[PDB]
mmCIF file of N, CA and C in Angstrom:
data_model
loop_
_atom_site.group_PDB
_atom_site.id
_atom_site.type_symbol
_atom_site.label_atom_id
_atom_site.label_comp_id
_atom_site.label_asym_id
_atom_site.label_seq_id
_atom_site.Cartn_x
_atom_site.Cartn_y
_atom_site.Cartn_z
ATOM 1 N N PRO A 1 24.675 -17.596 27.183
ATOM 2 C CA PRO A 1 24.331 -18.893 26.598
ATOM 3 C C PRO A 1 24.376 -18.902 25.077
ATOM 4 N N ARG A 2 25.223 -19.764 24.518
ATOM 5 C CA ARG A 2 25.364 -19.897 23.075
ATOM 6 C C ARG A 2 25.826 -21.312 22.768
ATOM 7 N N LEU A 3 25.899 -21.626 21.480
ATOM 8 C CA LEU A 3 26.131 -23.000 21.044
ATOM 9 C C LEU A 3 26.413 -22.992 19.548
ATOM 10 N N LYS A 4 26.472 -24.190 18.966
ATOM 11 C CA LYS A 4 26.794 -24.402 17.563
ATOM 12 C C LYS A 4 25.691 -25.207 16.892
ATOM 13 N N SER A 5 25.741 -25.242 15.562
ATOM 14 C CA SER A 5 24.727 -25.961 14.795
ATOM 15 C C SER A 5 24.912 -27.464 14.916
ATOM 16 N N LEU A 6 26.077 -27.956 14.524
ATOM 17 C CA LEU A 6 26.282 -29.383 14.385
ATOM 18 C C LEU A 6 26.410 -30.040 15.751
ATOM 19 N N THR A 7 26.187 -31.350 15.767
ATOM 20 C CA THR A 7 26.032 -32.107 16.995
ATOM 21 C C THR A 7 26.837 -33.394 16.904
ATOM 22 N N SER A 8 26.735 -34.202 17.960
ATOM 23 C CA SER A 8 27.432 -35.482 18.050
ATOM 24 C C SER A 8 26.512 -36.642 18.400
ATOM 25 N N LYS A 9 25.470 -36.404 19.200
ATOM 26 C CA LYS A 9 24.500 -37.445 19.510
ATOM 27 C C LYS A 9 23.611 -37.795 18.330
ATOM 28 N N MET A 10 23.732 -37.072 17.220
ATOM 29 C CA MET A 10 22.925 -37.324 16.044
ATOM 30 C C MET A 10 23.089 -38.758 15.569
ATOM 31 N N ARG A 11 22.044 -39.259 14.933
ATOM 32 C CA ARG A 11 22.118 -40.531 14.238
ATOM 33 C C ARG A 11 23.027 -40.389 13.028
ATOM 34 N N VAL A 12 24.095 -41.177 12.998
ATOM 35 C CA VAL A 12 25.154 -41.038 12.007
ATOM 36 C C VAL A 12 25.670 -42.437 11.701
ATOM 37 N N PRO A 13 26.211 -42.704 10.512
ATOM 38 C CA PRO A 13 26.810 -44.017 10.278
ATOM 39 C C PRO A 13 28.021 -44.232 11.165
ATOM 40 N N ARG A 14 28.452 -45.488 11.250
ATOM 41 C CA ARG A 14 29.517 -45.903 12.156
ATOM 42 C C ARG A 14 30.216 -47.121 11.575
ATOM 43 N N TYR A 15 31.500 -46.973 11.240
ATOM 44 C CA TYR A 15 32.295 -48.129 10.840
ATOM 45 C C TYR A 15 32.318 -49.154 11.959
ATOM 46 N N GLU A 16 32.930 -48.784 13.071
ATOM 47 C CA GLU A 16 32.681 -49.414 14.346
ATOM 48 C C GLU A 16 32.102 -48.346 15.253
ATOM 49 N N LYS A 17 31.843 -48.733 16.495
ATOM 50 C CA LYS A 17 30.894 -47.994 17.314
ATOM 51 C C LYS A 17 31.433 -46.624 17.701
ATOM 52 N N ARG A 18 32.658 -46.574 18.221
ATOM 53 C CA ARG A 18 33.171 -45.312 18.745
ATOM 54 C C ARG A 18 33.395 -44.304 17.633
ATOM 55 N N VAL A 19 33.575 -44.779 16.405
ATOM 56 C CA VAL A 19 33.963 -43.887 15.327
ATOM 57 C C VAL A 19 32.780 -43.034 14.907
ATOM 58 N N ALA A 20 33.037 -41.742 14.740
ATOM 59 C CA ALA A 20 32.131 -40.814 14.085
ATOM 60 C C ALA A 20 32.824 -40.302 12.832
ATOM 61 N N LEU A 21 32.153 -40.439 11.695
ATOM 62 C CA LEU A 21 32.820 -40.327 10.407
ATOM 63 C C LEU A 21 32.787 -38.930 9.833
ATOM 64 N N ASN A 22 31.617 -38.309 9.781
ATOM 65 C CA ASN A 22 31.518 -36.939 9.295
ATOM 66 C C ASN A 22 32.121 -36.059 10.374
ATOM 67 N N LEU A 23 33.436 -35.903 10.291
ATOM 68 C CA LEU A 23 34.182 -35.163 11.291
ATOM 69 C C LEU A 23 33.684 -33.734 11.354
ATOM 70 N N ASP A 24 33.405 -33.275 12.565
ATOM 71 C CA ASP A 24 32.675 -32.029 12.758
ATOM 72 C C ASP A 24 33.641 -30.852 12.908
ATOM 73 N N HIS A 25 34.547 -30.758 11.933
ATOM 74 C CA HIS A 25 35.345 -29.565 11.696
ATOM 75 C C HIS A 25 34.998 -28.931 10.359
ATOM 76 N N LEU A 26 33.864 -29.303 9.769
ATOM 77 C CA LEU A 26 33.466 -28.841 8.452
ATOM 78 C C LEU A 26 32.627 -27.592 8.519
ATOM 79 N N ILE A 27 32.825 -26.792 9.561
ATOM 80 C CA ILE A 27 32.069 -25.567 9.727
ATOM 81 C C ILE A 27 32.316 -24.630 8.562
ATOM 82 N N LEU A 28 33.511 -24.681 7.984
ATOM 83 C CA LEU A 28 33.965 -23.693 7.014
ATOM 84 C C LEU A 28 34.191 -24.401 5.694
ATOM 85 N N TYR A 29 33.106 -24.588 4.949
ATOM 86 C CA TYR A 29 33.219 -25.066 3.582
ATOM 87 C C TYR A 29 31.918 -24.698 2.875
ATOM 88 N N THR A 30 31.934 -23.581 2.151
ATOM 89 C CA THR A 30 30.801 -23.158 1.331
ATOM 90 C C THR A 30 31.329 -22.419 0.115
ATOM 91 N N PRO A 31 31.975 -23.121 -0.780
ATOM 92 C CA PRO A 31 32.340 -22.501 -2.052
ATOM 93 C C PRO A 31 31.115 -22.189 -2.885
ATOM 94 N N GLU A 32 31.326 -21.567 -4.039
ATOM 95 C CA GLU A 32 30.222 -21.265 -4.933
ATOM 96 C C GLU A 32 29.548 -22.546 -5.393
ATOM 97 N N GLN A 33 28.228 -22.477 -5.519
ATOM 98 C CA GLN A 33 27.461 -23.667 -5.844
ATOM 99 C C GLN A 33 27.749 -24.126 -7.260
ATOM 100 N N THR A 34 27.606 -23.218 -8.222
ATOM 101 C CA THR A 34 27.829 -23.577 -9.613
ATOM 102 C C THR A 34 29.271 -23.980 -9.852
ATOM 103 N N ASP A 35 30.195 -23.440 -9.064
ATOM 104 C CA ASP A 35 31.599 -23.770 -9.228
ATOM 105 C C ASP A 35 31.881 -25.241 -8.980
ATOM 106 N N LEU A 36 31.021 -25.920 -8.234
ATOM 107 C CA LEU A 36 31.223 -27.320 -7.911
ATOM 108 C C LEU A 36 30.580 -28.264 -8.905
ATOM 109 N N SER A 37 29.614 -27.790 -9.682
ATOM 110 C CA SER A 37 28.768 -28.658 -10.489
ATOM 111 C C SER A 37 29.535 -29.413 -11.557
ATOM 112 N N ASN A 38 28.814 -30.236 -12.303
ATOM 113 C CA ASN A 38 29.309 -30.789 -13.546
ATOM 114 C C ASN A 38 28.892 -29.958 -14.748
ATOM 115 N N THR A 39 27.842 -29.150 -14.618
ATOM 116 C CA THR A 39 27.367 -28.370 -15.753
ATOM 117 C C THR A 39 28.356 -27.300 -16.175
ATOM 118 N N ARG A 40 29.223 -26.864 -15.276
ATOM 119 C CA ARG A 40 30.393 -26.080 -15.636
ATOM 120 C C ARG A 40 31.606 -26.983 -15.638
ATOM 121 N N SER A 41 32.502 -26.727 -16.577
ATOM 122 C CA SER A 41 33.691 -27.537 -16.711
ATOM 123 C C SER A 41 34.773 -27.025 -15.777
ATOM 124 N N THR A 42 35.959 -27.589 -15.935
ATOM 125 C CA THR A 42 37.030 -27.430 -14.975
ATOM 126 C C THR A 42 38.026 -26.376 -15.415
ATOM 127 N N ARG A 43 38.849 -25.992 -14.454
ATOM 128 C CA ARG A 43 39.816 -24.933 -14.660
ATOM 129 C C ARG A 43 40.928 -25.380 -15.589
ATOM 130 N N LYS A 44 41.295 -26.654 -15.514
ATOM 131 C CA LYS A 44 42.326 -27.184 -16.391
ATOM 132 C C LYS A 44 41.898 -27.086 -17.842
ATOM 133 N N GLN A 45 40.683 -27.539 -18.134
ATOM 134 C CA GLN A 45 40.169 -27.460 -19.490
ATOM 135 C C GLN A 45 40.162 -26.023 -19.963
ATOM 136 N N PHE A 46 39.698 -25.137 -19.090
ATOM 137 C CA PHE A 46 39.633 -23.720 -19.387
ATOM 138 C C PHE A 46 41.005 -23.177 -19.717
ATOM 139 N N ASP A 47 42.038 -23.762 -19.122
ATOM 140 C CA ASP A 47 43.396 -23.344 -19.430
ATOM 141 C C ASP A 47 43.828 -23.877 -20.786
ATOM 142 N N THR A 48 43.583 -25.158 -21.034
ATOM 143 C CA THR A 48 44.150 -25.783 -22.218
ATOM 144 C C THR A 48 43.495 -25.273 -23.482
ATOM 145 N N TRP A 49 42.240 -24.861 -23.400
ATOM 146 C CA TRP A 49 41.626 -24.179 -24.529
ATOM 147 C C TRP A 49 42.349 -22.866 -24.791
ATOM 148 N N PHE A 50 42.486 -22.078 -23.728
ATOM 149 C CA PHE A 50 43.130 -20.777 -23.751
ATOM 150 C C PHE A 50 44.571 -20.837 -24.223
ATOM 151 N N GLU A 51 45.197 -22.004 -24.149
ATOM 152 C CA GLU A 51 46.566 -22.200 -24.595
ATOM 153 C C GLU A 51 46.640 -22.802 -25.985
ATOM 154 N N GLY A 52 45.723 -23.703 -26.308
ATOM 155 C CA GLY A 52 45.712 -24.274 -27.638
ATOM 156 C C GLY A 52 45.431 -23.229 -28.685
ATOM 157 N N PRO B 1 -3.187 -50.182 42.265
ATOM 158 C CA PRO B 1 -3.599 -50.969 41.100
ATOM 159 C C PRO B 1 -2.845 -50.603 39.828
ATOM 160 N N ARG B 2 -2.149 -51.581 39.253
ATOM 161 C CA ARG B 2 -1.392 -51.388 38.025
ATOM 162 C C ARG B 2 -1.305 -52.719 37.298
ATOM 163 N N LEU B 3 -0.736 -52.686 36.102
ATOM 164 C CA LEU B 3 -0.763 -53.841 35.213
ATOM 165 C C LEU B 3 0.179 -53.580 34.046
ATOM 166 N N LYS B 4 0.132 -54.470 33.054
ATOM 167 C CA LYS B 4 0.994 -54.436 31.881
ATOM 168 C C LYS B 4 0.150 -54.429 30.616
ATOM 169 N N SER B 5 0.808 -54.137 29.495
ATOM 170 C CA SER B 5 0.111 -54.074 28.214
ATOM 171 C C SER B 5 -0.261 -55.465 27.722
ATOM 172 N N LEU B 6 0.734 -56.320 27.550
ATOM 173 C CA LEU B 6 0.527 -57.587 26.882
ATOM 174 C C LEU B 6 -0.216 -58.558 27.788
ATOM 175 N N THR B 7 -0.815 -59.567 27.161
ATOM 176 C CA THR B 7 -1.756 -60.453 27.820
ATOM 177 C C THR B 7 -1.449 -61.892 27.440
ATOM 178 N N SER B 8 -2.281 -62.805 27.948
ATOM 179 C CA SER B 8 -2.145 -64.234 27.692
ATOM 180 C C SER B 8 -3.429 -64.877 27.188
ATOM 181 N N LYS B 9 -4.593 -64.397 27.635
ATOM 182 C CA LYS B 9 -5.863 -64.906 27.135
ATOM 183 C C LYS B 9 -6.149 -64.482 25.704
ATOM 184 N N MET B 10 -5.299 -63.640 25.121
ATOM 185 C CA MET B 10 -5.490 -63.172 23.762
ATOM 186 C C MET B 10 -5.574 -64.339 22.794
ATOM 187 N N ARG B 11 -6.292 -64.110 21.705
ATOM 188 C CA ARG B 11 -6.295 -65.041 20.592
ATOM 189 C C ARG B 11 -4.931 -65.030 19.926
ATOM 190 N N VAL B 12 -4.281 -66.188 19.898
ATOM 191 C CA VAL B 12 -2.895 -66.307 19.461
ATOM 192 C C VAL B 12 -2.759 -67.651 18.761
ATOM 193 N N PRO B 13 -1.834 -67.822 17.818
ATOM 194 C CA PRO B 13 -1.637 -69.152 17.242
ATOM 195 C C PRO B 13 -1.122 -70.127 18.282
ATOM 196 N N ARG B 14 -1.195 -71.413 17.947
ATOM 197 C CA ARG B 14 -0.874 -72.494 18.870
ATOM 198 C C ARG B 14 -0.400 -73.699 18.075
ATOM 199 N N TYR B 15 0.864 -74.087 18.266
ATOM 200 C CA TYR B 15 1.350 -75.331 17.681
ATOM 201 C C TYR B 15 0.524 -76.497 18.188
ATOM 202 N N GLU B 16 0.619 -76.760 19.480
ATOM 203 C CA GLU B 16 -0.385 -77.507 20.201
ATOM 204 C C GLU B 16 -0.960 -76.567 21.244
ATOM 205 N N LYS B 17 -1.879 -77.096 22.039
ATOM 206 C CA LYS B 17 -2.820 -76.242 22.749
ATOM 207 C C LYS B 17 -2.132 -75.435 23.840
ATOM 208 N N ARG B 18 -1.352 -76.097 24.690
ATOM 209 C CA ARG B 18 -0.786 -75.405 25.843
ATOM 210 C C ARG B 18 0.238 -74.367 25.414
ATOM 211 N N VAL B 19 0.819 -74.536 24.231
ATOM 212 C CA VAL B 19 1.924 -73.682 23.834
ATOM 213 C C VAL B 19 1.411 -72.298 23.473
ATOM 214 N N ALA B 20 2.101 -71.283 23.974
ATOM 215 C CA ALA B 20 1.951 -69.908 23.536
ATOM 216 C C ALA B 20 3.272 -69.472 22.924
ATOM 217 N N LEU B 21 3.214 -68.981 21.692
ATOM 218 C CA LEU B 21 4.406 -68.863 20.867
ATOM 219 C C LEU B 21 5.085 -67.516 20.980
ATOM 220 N N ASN B 22 4.335 -66.433 20.830
ATOM 221 C CA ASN B 22 4.908 -65.101 20.984
ATOM 222 C C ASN B 22 5.168 -64.919 22.468
ATOM 223 N N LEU B 23 6.342 -65.378 22.885
ATOM 224 C CA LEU B 23 6.714 -65.358 24.287
ATOM 225 C C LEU B 23 6.716 -63.934 24.801
ATOM 226 N N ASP B 24 6.058 -63.728 25.931
ATOM 227 C CA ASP B 24 5.751 -62.384 26.402
ATOM 228 C C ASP B 24 6.841 -61.877 27.346
ATOM 229 N N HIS B 25 8.077 -61.968 26.855
ATOM 230 C CA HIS B 25 9.218 -61.268 27.427
ATOM 231 C C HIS B 25 9.761 -60.222 26.465
ATOM 232 N N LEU B 26 8.989 -59.858 25.445
ATOM 233 C CA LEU B 26 9.423 -58.941 24.407
ATOM 234 C C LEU B 26 9.086 -57.510 24.740
ATOM 235 N N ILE B 27 9.006 -57.195 26.028
ATOM 236 C CA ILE B 27 8.685 -55.849 26.456
ATOM 237 C C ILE B 27 9.727 -54.870 25.961
ATOM 238 N N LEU B 28 10.970 -55.322 25.832
ATOM 239 C CA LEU B 28 12.111 -54.445 25.587
ATOM 240 C C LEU B 28 12.699 -54.808 24.240
ATOM 241 N N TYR B 29 12.099 -54.267 23.188
ATOM 242 C CA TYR B 29 12.689 -54.369 21.863
ATOM 243 C C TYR B 29 12.062 -53.268 21.011
ATOM 244 N N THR B 30 12.764 -52.144 20.892
ATOM 245 C CA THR B 30 12.347 -51.044 20.022
ATOM 246 C C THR B 30 13.586 -50.353 19.487
ATOM 247 N N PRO B 31 14.323 -51.014 18.632
ATOM 248 C CA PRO B 31 15.418 -50.330 17.947
ATOM 249 C C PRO B 31 14.897 -49.282 16.988
ATOM 250 N N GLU B 32 15.808 -48.553 16.355
ATOM 251 C CA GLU B 32 15.412 -47.552 15.380
ATOM 252 C C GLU B 32 14.676 -48.201 14.221
ATOM 253 N N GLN B 33 13.668 -47.495 13.724
ATOM 254 C CA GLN B 33 12.821 -48.062 12.689
ATOM 255 C C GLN B 33 13.584 -48.216 11.390
ATOM 256 N N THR B 34 14.200 -47.133 10.928
ATOM 257 C CA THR B 34 14.930 -47.181 9.671
ATOM 258 C C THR B 34 16.108 -48.132 9.753
ATOM 259 N N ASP B 35 16.664 -48.311 10.948
ATOM 260 C CA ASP B 35 17.800 -49.200 11.113
ATOM 261 C C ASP B 35 17.460 -50.639 10.775
ATOM 262 N N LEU B 36 16.187 -51.008 10.833
ATOM 263 C CA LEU B 36 15.767 -52.369 10.564
ATOM 264 C C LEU B 36 15.413 -52.611 9.111
ATOM 265 N N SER B 37 15.132 -51.557 8.354
ATOM 266 C CA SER B 37 14.543 -51.689 7.028
ATOM 267 C C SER B 37 15.447 -52.410 6.046
ATOM 268 N N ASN B 38 14.948 -52.576 4.830
ATOM 269 C CA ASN B 38 15.772 -52.953 3.699
ATOM 270 C C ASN B 38 16.254 -51.744 2.914
ATOM 271 N N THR B 39 15.575 -50.605 3.040
ATOM 272 C CA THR B 39 15.962 -49.430 2.270
ATOM 273 C C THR B 39 17.308 -48.876 2.693
ATOM 274 N N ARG B 40 17.736 -49.142 3.918
ATOM 275 C CA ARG B 40 19.112 -48.933 4.326
ATOM 276 C C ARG B 40 19.837 -50.263 4.320
ATOM 277 N N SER B 41 21.099 -50.218 3.927
ATOM 278 C CA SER B 41 21.890 -51.423 3.840
ATOM 279 C C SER B 41 22.503 -51.738 5.196
ATOM 280 N N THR B 42 23.381 -52.724 5.196
ATOM 281 C CA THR B 42 23.861 -53.339 6.416
ATOM 282 C C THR B 42 25.217 -52.797 6.819
ATOM 283 N N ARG B 43 25.561 -53.104 8.059
ATOM 284 C CA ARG B 43 26.784 -52.606 8.652
ATOM 285 C C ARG B 43 28.002 -53.261 8.032
ATOM 286 N N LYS B 44 27.874 -54.529 7.659
ATOM 287 C CA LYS B 44 28.977 -55.232 7.020
ATOM 288 C C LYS B 44 29.338 -54.574 5.702
ATOM 289 N N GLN B 45 28.332 -54.316 4.871
ATOM 290 C CA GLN B 45 28.572 -53.656 3.599
ATOM 291 C C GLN B 45 29.236 -52.316 3.821
ATOM 292 N N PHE B 46 28.714 -51.575 4.794
ATOM 293 C CA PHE B 46 29.241 -50.271 5.137
ATOM 294 C C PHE B 46 30.697 -50.364 5.532
ATOM 295 N N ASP B 47 31.088 -51.495 6.109
ATOM 296 C CA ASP B 47 32.483 -51.694 6.465
ATOM 297 C C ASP B 47 33.314 -51.995 5.230
ATOM 298 N N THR B 48 32.832 -52.900 4.385
ATOM 299 C CA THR B 48 33.665 -53.387 3.299
ATOM 300 C C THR B 48 33.881 -52.323 2.245
ATOM 301 N N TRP B 49 32.934 -51.409 2.093
ATOM 302 C CA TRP B 49 33.172 -50.254 1.240
ATOM 303 C C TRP B 49 34.299 -49.412 1.820
ATOM 304 N N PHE B 50 34.154 -49.086 3.101
ATOM 305 C CA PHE B 50 35.101 -48.277 3.852
ATOM 306 C C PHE B 50 36.494 -48.880 3.888
ATOM 307 N N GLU B 51 36.613 -50.177 3.644
ATOM 308 C CA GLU B 51 37.892 -50.866 3.619
ATOM 309 C C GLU B 51 38.423 -51.049 2.211
ATOM 310 N N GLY B 52 37.540 -51.299 1.256
ATOM 311 C CA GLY B 52 37.979 -51.434 -0.115
ATOM 312 C C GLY B 52 38.568 -50.147 -0.637
#
């Protein structure tokens, strides 16, 4: 006996009724936390400084 | 011996005397609490964002 975390009967928004929006294939998405923030800048900027 | 929750001899408002206003067929109405609030917005808005 085993199972998964995410579910489908959960209370979730619905455009129309049958639709479930937060598609439950997102099991694999956990990049670095700080890497996503705004407090760190972007890779493009980091490049253009390094080139200028 | 059995019975129901709601009653008729209860103190209730009355337009005129014979009338009972909170019609006692409301046994079946318990949608989700948050679904009724104002703190969550409406399904129409949720659609028009999703379409815009």
